[PDB]
Amino acid sequence: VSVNYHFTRQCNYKCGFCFHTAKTSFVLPLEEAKRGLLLLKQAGLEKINFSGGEPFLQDRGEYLGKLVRFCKEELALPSVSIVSNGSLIRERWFKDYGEYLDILAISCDSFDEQVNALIGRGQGKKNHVENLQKLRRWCRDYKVAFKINSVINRFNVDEDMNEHIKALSPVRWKVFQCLLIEGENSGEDALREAERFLISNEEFETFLERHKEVSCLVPESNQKMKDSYLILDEYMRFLNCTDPSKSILDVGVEEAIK
Numbered sequence: 402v403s404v405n406y407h408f409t410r411q412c413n414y415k416c417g418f419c420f421h422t423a424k425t426s427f428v429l430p431l432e433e434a435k436r437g438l439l440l441l442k443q444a445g446l447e448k449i450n451f452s453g454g455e456p457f458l459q460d461r462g463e464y465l466g467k468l469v470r471f472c473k474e475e476l477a478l479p480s481v482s483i484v485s486n487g488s489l490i491r492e493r494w495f496k497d498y499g500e501y502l503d504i505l506a507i508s509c510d511s512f513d514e515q516v517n518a519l520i521g522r523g524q525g526k527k528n529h530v531e532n533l534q535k536l537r538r539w540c541r542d543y544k545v546a547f548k549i550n551s552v553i554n555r556f557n558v559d560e561d562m563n564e565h566i567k568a569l570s571p572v573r574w575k576v577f578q579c580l581l582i583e584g585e586n587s588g589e590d591a592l593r594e595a596e597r598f599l600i601s602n603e604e605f606e607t608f609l610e611r612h613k614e615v616s617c618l619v620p621e622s623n624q625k626m627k628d629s630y631l632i633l634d635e636y637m638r639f640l641n642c643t644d645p646s647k648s649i650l651d652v653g654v655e656e657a658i659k
């Protein structure tokens with residue numbers, strides 16, 4: 402019914418906890434991605450979420466825009482979403498592709514710009530929060546629903562974001578407990594080592610209680626992510642958050658799900 406397509410692993414940020422790291426530079430040929438997306442449509446997909454990696458990095462966002470247009474215009478998917486760090490989104494992308502996009506979720510873990518910088522949620526300019534605010538205004542002007550995703554971690558577990566989130570008035574505020582995935586952000590050879598970012602379930606629940614007045618908050622605990630977050634990787638193989646499947650481009654959707 403719903404799928405997270407991490408179609409690229411390249412990114413311009415350096416988030417210390419990143420759980421889907423730059424292990425490859427492979428992106429499928431556009432027509433191959435279209436072929437697999439059609440299979441998903443034929444298997445009953447109704448909601449697609451483009452992720453990564455940074456979705457807007459590949460071909461300056463043009464690759465992503467073509468797949469978004471394909472999903473809306475050719476596959477007639479009623480819900481097409483992107484999750485992005487926001488830093489590379491050009492207004493021209495909205496002009497060219499925004500009519501095909503339902504939802505843009507921007508990842509922002511703190512409203513203290515210095516906290517984002519220290520976490521690696523940036524590329525040096527230390528203006529990640531201010532960019533989030535501009536993207537809100539573009540979503541309003543181009544009629545795209547705006548969501549914000551935050552990873553709750555050691556450095557923001559005590560932050561009060563109530564007034565900041567209410568002022569941004571997002572459709573949904575998705576709040577992820579920092580998640581460890583072996584081979585991604587855990588291991589001597591991993592590109593990231595996220596252990597120092599982790600928080601306990603009790604700490605996570607405390608953050609949620611602090612923000613109980615935010616009615617658009619939606620929590621994503623570790624257990625929820627393990628139970629319900631499905632990944633389609635850059636080869637269109639299925640992965641979970643707990644070897645990859647065969648690619649749907651080889652064995653089809655059904656055999657790949659097992």
Ligand SMILES: C[C@H]1O[C@@H](n2cnc3c(N)ncnc32)[C@H](O)[C@@H]1O
Binds near residue numbers: 418508
């Ligand atoms: C796809 C979503 O995953 C979030 N994200 C990135 N790394 C982690 C992690 N270690 N734990 C939980 N969420 C994470 C991104 O910030 C984005 O919002």
Ligand code: MET
Binds near residue numbers: 453454455484486507
């Ligand atoms: C592993 S996160 C992938 C989506 C995007 N890079 C973000 O952080 O919002």
Ligand code: SF4
Binds near residue numbers: 412421453455508
């Ligand atoms: S979590 Fe950070 S480093 Fe990882 S892909 Fe998203 S923006 Fe890039």
